Design a protein around this ligand. Sequence first.
Ligand SMILES: C[C@H]1CCCN1Cc1nc2ccc(NC(=O)c3ccc4c(cnn4C)c3)cc2[nH]1
Length: 143
Amino acid sequence: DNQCTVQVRLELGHRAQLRKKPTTEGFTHDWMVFVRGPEQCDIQHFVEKVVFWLHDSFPKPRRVCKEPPYKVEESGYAGFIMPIEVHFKNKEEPRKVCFTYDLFLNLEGNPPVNHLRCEKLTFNNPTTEFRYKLLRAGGVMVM
Ligand SMILES: C[C@H]1CCCN1Cc1nc2ccc(NC(=O)c3ccc4c(cnn4C)c3)cc2[nH]1
């Protein structure tokens, strides 16, 4: 009767390509990982920050974006599993969502990687305040 659900969408993704020539440090690959909304949505209305947890070998592996673009650009030698936390401008639970992101590179001879992973978040009965932030960002009421 006073029940209420807001869906929003997140796109996580990454690009990777073999450098024509490795770096001095033997980095064979360029890559880029990101969190964005669909086109014409503004996830910054409900997203406080995004944290990208790189392999422990990276300098400052806890990479934070407090505003768009939410992305890391790097070079490296191998793929890994990257925890990505999306923190919300939410007073209550849930405050964040954690994704296990497969950052995989192209094996030499294979063309560049260009992957997208679409995530639908369903917020049940958000506070009036946080409901407003979700709708500002291009979220939708359901149910
Ligand atoms: C462009 C500049 C901006 C600051 C730093 N970056 C250069 C730069 N500094 C690095 C330090 C470490 C690594 N490590 C890896 O590439 C890496 C990936 C997967 C791995 C391992 C070991 N096991 N597995 C599964 C290592 C990459 C780096 N790239």
